[PDB]
Design a protein around this nucleic acid. Structure first.
Length: 84
RNA sequence: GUAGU
């Protein structure tokens, strides 16, 4: 599982991602790659599902939209989470 | 308003 989420609004948050992505399955993780000085979302983030069956639905649907902006969700390039 | 560990 795990997906990159492009085309977001500058008003989108990772709680707002969970609010939209909870329609396809329970999310295991959500992120928005925002600037900490200007609070701009950069127009993108990430979401992980508790099962692949939520990833399957997000790929199978032809269009997505959050805060009146067309979003572009896709399979995430592999990475390793760091402990803290 | 589009690539993170």
């Amino acid at each position: 599982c795990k997906m990159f989420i492009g085309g977001l609004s500058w008003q989108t948050t990772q709680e707002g991602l969970r609010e939209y992505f909870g329609q396809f399955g329970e999310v295991k993780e959500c992120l928005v790659m925002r600037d900490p000085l200007t609070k701009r979302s950069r127009g993108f983030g990430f979401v992980t599902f508790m099962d692949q069956a939520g990833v399957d639905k997000v790929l199978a649907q032809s269009r997505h939209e959050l805060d009146s902006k067309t979003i572009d969700p896709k399979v995430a390039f592999p990475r390793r989470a760091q402990p803290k």
